[PDB]
């Protein structure tokens, strides 16, 4: 599980608390709209906990999705 690459490790400096920034937040979601587990995102407990609320806020704002379709099955 979580076998490819390091979501946080390849990325720049960013505000984890910014809901309006879509381009960066997209990277924390899977093929589906799911929030990636720590083992993928590479974040810490506090970081992750903040990320979740940020993403959920963005979803409610219609910036990020909730769920998505899986392709090429």
């Amino acid at each position: 599980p979580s076998r490819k690459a390091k979501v946080k490790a390849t990325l720049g400096e960013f505000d984890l608390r910014d809901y309006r920034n879509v381009e960066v937040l997209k990277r924390f979601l899977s093929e589906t709209g799911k929030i990636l587990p720590r083992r993928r995102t590479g974040l810490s407990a506090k970081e992750q906990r903040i990320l979740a609320k940020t993403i959920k806020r963005a979803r409610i704002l219609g910036l990020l999705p909730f769920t998505e379709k899986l392709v090429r099955k």
């Binding site: 909730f66 769920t67 379709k69 899986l70 392709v71 090429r72 099955k73």
Partner: protein
């Protein structure tokens, strides 16, 4: 009679049966088929073989509408899901894309006791 030639193919696969609906790109059904549409009656509808025959029957009745290429959408876990996929690929309809649309609630509704230890 339509002459559509490109459309969607919905494979709804549960443990008890497999039903396949070929539709136009607007979503409206052209034809459908299932385990019971072919000879099968009892538990045998849930068979992968039944899914094959159903998929093929749906595809045939679809090609009677002049259908050429379809996009596959899959719902539900059960045997003969992937068999329906494979049969559609071997059907004579070009399969463009395959997608899993399987519905899941976000903790929505209480399951029957059979499905419990969950919600």
């Amino acid at each position: 009679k339509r002459q559509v030639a490109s459309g969607r193919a919905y494979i709804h696969a549960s443990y008890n049966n497999t039903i396949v609906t070929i539709t136009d790109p607007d979503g409206n059904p052209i034809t459908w088929s299932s385990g019971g549409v072919i000879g099968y009656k009892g538990s045998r509808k849930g068979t992968p073989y039944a899914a094959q025959l159903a998929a093929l029957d749906a595809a045939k009745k679809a090609m009677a509408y002049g259908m050429q290429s379809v996009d596959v959408i899959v719902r539900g876990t059960g045997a003969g899901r992937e068999q329906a996929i494979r049969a559609l690929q071997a059907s004579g309809l070009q399969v463009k894309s395959i997608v899993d649309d399987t519905p899941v609630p976000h903790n929505g509704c209480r399951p029957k006791k059979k499905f419990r230890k969950a919600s």
